[PDB]
Amino acid sequence: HSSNVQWRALSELAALCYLIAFQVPRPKIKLIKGEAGQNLLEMMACDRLSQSGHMLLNLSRGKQDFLKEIVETFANKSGQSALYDALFSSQSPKDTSFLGSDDIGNIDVREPELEDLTRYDVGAIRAHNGSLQHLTWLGLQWNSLPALPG
């Protein structure tokens, strides 16, 4: 909704967010008590990697190695305060806010591989109960890619 200057800065900020998310490893599924619980947790993991994945790409296709710049410039702790700033009102206590205390260490800054992305999508089809919204989105996200979805 906002202007262009805010868009780029915000998309820059968002690119970092999606990146942080994608980096997060697949959760330890074996560690759950039951079959239903663990399958659920994994399902969400696939959803995270898939959604963030396509976003990371669509934002990185704008420019050449656009992702590298995002990390090299905002991975700095200065970005953490610029993120808290744009998202929240600074008046709230910045101590008990998880966003301000997270240890952003060694962002992979590696664009996602299509083959990995496919198995993330396929595993997350049941993430949103297969709403035609979900699939029509994925199908469109793959509409710009050189590899087609299964």
Binding site: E72, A75, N76, K77, I104, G105, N106, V109
Partner: peptide
């Protein structure tokens, strides 16, 4: 340097 490391030596 891997991203996160280059920050901790910067802090």
């Amino acid at each position: 340097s891997n991203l996160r490391n280059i920050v901790t030596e910067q802090l």
